[PDB]
């Protein structure tokens, strides 16, 4: 049968967690104030999956464009198309490679 | 599923939350003076085959549950759909 | 049954999850350890003989059973059960499938040819690697000739080439 495409349709390994990673995660990712121009990494947190971006954006580097209430607007690229990911800080990490 | 016969709900005309009575939606009777009905009777007059399609195969098992909320203060009516399921019981 | 050459070659992933396999056959091998199995009495035995695979392939459960009977019968007749320990080291976890039109086995088995070609279960096999130890014998050094003969007779019933390796415990 042709592949079904739910919003989380091949995400077993990506949303699984190791036994040492179980439960709540630390709150330090909430406390990063990203300014426009900052570089972030999209690293999905499985405990907050309802606000997480799609699996195709995991491990991608984006640029903060603005803030919308409590989320951040991130301009990234999927191959060659420009995509906008609006996500909260718990799925983001600061990019240290410049 | 059971739904109350009265709810507290925002009223756009009152611009505040008021008590709304709850009833089932009932479609009105088709009036013969409607433009589409007039065109249909015109098409029905004369010789020929049956002039319009008529569905034979139906697939839905339930209709979308439609309810009318009437503001008790001003009589404003809000018709909403609760989704496709069996008929609700007003309680 | 089909010839064993039909299932000798490893051609796909292992098929072992019995909670997903419908109508998986039972393992017909009745016992796997022969002779004096208690380690307190195995302390007497000092020689280890090993029938070891030479190629990679699949051995059917019936082939493993036939080798087991021939070796165990020889060892009982000529060494006695108190003087050896014999273990069939592999278990037939893999489930074999065959595509054939047949009796009441599903409505998709009544369509002929390669349409709906995923076969039904047909038997069990043990997937083995080169150098894998198929048969393990512990014995006293005086019975070396009889143990080698039993291993040769067991090897005659298997679908892949093997060899006998003798060493001390």
């Amino acid at each position: 049968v042709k592949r079904t495409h739910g919003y989380r349709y091949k995400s077993r390994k990506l949303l699984s967690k190791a036994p040492r990673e179980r439960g709540m995660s630390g709150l330090s990712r909430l406390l990063y104030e990203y300014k426009p121009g900052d570089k972030v990494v999209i690293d999905i947190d499985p405990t907050f999956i309802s606000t997480a971006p799609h699996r195709r954006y995991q491990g991608k580097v984006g640029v903060v464009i603005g803030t919308r209430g409590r989320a951040y607007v991130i301009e990234t690229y999927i191959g060659d198309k420009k995509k906008i990911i609006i996500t909260t800080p718990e799925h983001l990490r600061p990019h240290l490679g410049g | 599923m059971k739904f109350p016969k009265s709810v507290n709900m925002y009223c756009p005309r009152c611009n505040t939350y008021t008590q709304h009575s709850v009833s089932n939606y009932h479609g009105g009777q088709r009036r013969s003076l409607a433009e589409g009905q007039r065109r249909y009777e015109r098409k029905l007059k004369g010789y020929g085959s049956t002039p319009k399609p008529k569905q034979k195969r139906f697939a839905k098992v339930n209709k979308k549950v439609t309810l009318v909320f009437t503001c008790t203060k001003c009589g404003y009516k809000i018709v909403k759909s609760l989704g496709r399921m069996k008929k609700v019981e007003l309680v | 049954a089909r010839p064993a050459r039909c299932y000798r070659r490893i051609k796909g992933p292992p098929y072992t999850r019995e909670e997903y396999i419908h109508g998986a056959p039972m393992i017909q091998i009745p016992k796997f350890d022969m002779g004096t199995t208690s380690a307190a009495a195995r302390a007497a035995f000092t020689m280890v003989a090993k029938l070891v695979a030479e190629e990679r392939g699949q051995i059917r459960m019936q082939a493993l059973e036939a080798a087991r009977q021939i070796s165990s019968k020889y060892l009982t007749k000529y060494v006695g059960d108190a003087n050896y320990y014999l273990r069939l080291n592999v278990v037939p976890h893999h489930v074999l499938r065959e595509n054939r039109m047949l009796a009441m086995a599903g409505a998709d088995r009544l369509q002929e040819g390669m349409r709906l070609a995923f076969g039904s279960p047909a038997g069990r096999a043990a997937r083995v690697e080169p150098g894998q130890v198929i048969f393990y014998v512990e014995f006293k050094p005086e019975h070396l000739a009889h143990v080698k003969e039993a291993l040769r007779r067991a090897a005659s019933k298997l679908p892949i080439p093997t060899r006998i390796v003798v060493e001390p415990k």
Partner: protein
């Protein structure tokens, strides 16, 4: 504990001091937190800014600071809570904080509690802290009239029980029946001190 699959909780959770659900909700505010903590002897008031590598405490004080202004009441009654809140609010206003969110931790938010007394003192010092109108204790309890009434009844009824139950007040030189007036003098001292400091 036993086996690799056991997940040890957070250190502060297993020591029993941080509710991380409530802490996450507080951290969503992005405002400074007025942390109020109770001990058996003192009250701790802090203005904290949370940072990714560790919280930063702008101002922190327990009720030992009231001795600098000459407090002779108990260390952690409602009046002491109010005075501590006043001092912490004035210090925070000096250091530039104008708004804060109350953080009571594992304590219960019962109305008229000492945490709300501290919050009322902070509000009166000039720092805005959001709150309901029904949780701050009455002005009588803030002045300490409940302590005075209890001391008066105890002195009338069981004088030896009065001496036993308020020995430290008598050692300090303030009978518990004179608590409201002394609270008024100390509050006047603190207000005058920090208002002159703010003017200068």
């Amino acid at each position: 504990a036993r086996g690799a699959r056991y997940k040890v909780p957070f250190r502060r959770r297993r020591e029993g001091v941080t509710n991380y659900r409530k802490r996450r909700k507080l951290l969503l505010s992005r405002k400074p937190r007025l942390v109020v903590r109770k001990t058996n002897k003192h009250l701790i008031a802090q203005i904290v800014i949370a940072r990714p590598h560790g919280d930063e405490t702008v101002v922190g004080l327990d009720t030992r600071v009231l001795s600098k202004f000459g407090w002779k009441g108990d260390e952690n009654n409602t009046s002491a809570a109010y005075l501590l809140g006043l001092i912490v609010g004035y210090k925070a206003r000096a250091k530039g904080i104008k708004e804060a969110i109350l953080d009571i931790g594992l304590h219960r938010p019962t109305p008229g509690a000492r945490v709300f007394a501290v919050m009322k003192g902070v509000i009166d010092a000039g720092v805005e802290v959001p709150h309901g109108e029904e949780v701050v204790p009455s002005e009588e309890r803030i002045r300490g009239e409940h302590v005075a009434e209890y001391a008066k009844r105890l002195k009338e009824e069981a004088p030896e029980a009065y001496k036993a139950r308020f020995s430290r007040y008598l050692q300090r030189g303030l009978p518990p029946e004179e608590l409201p007036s002394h609270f008024e003098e100390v509050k006047k001292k603190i207000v005058e001190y920090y208002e002159q400091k703010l003017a200068k």
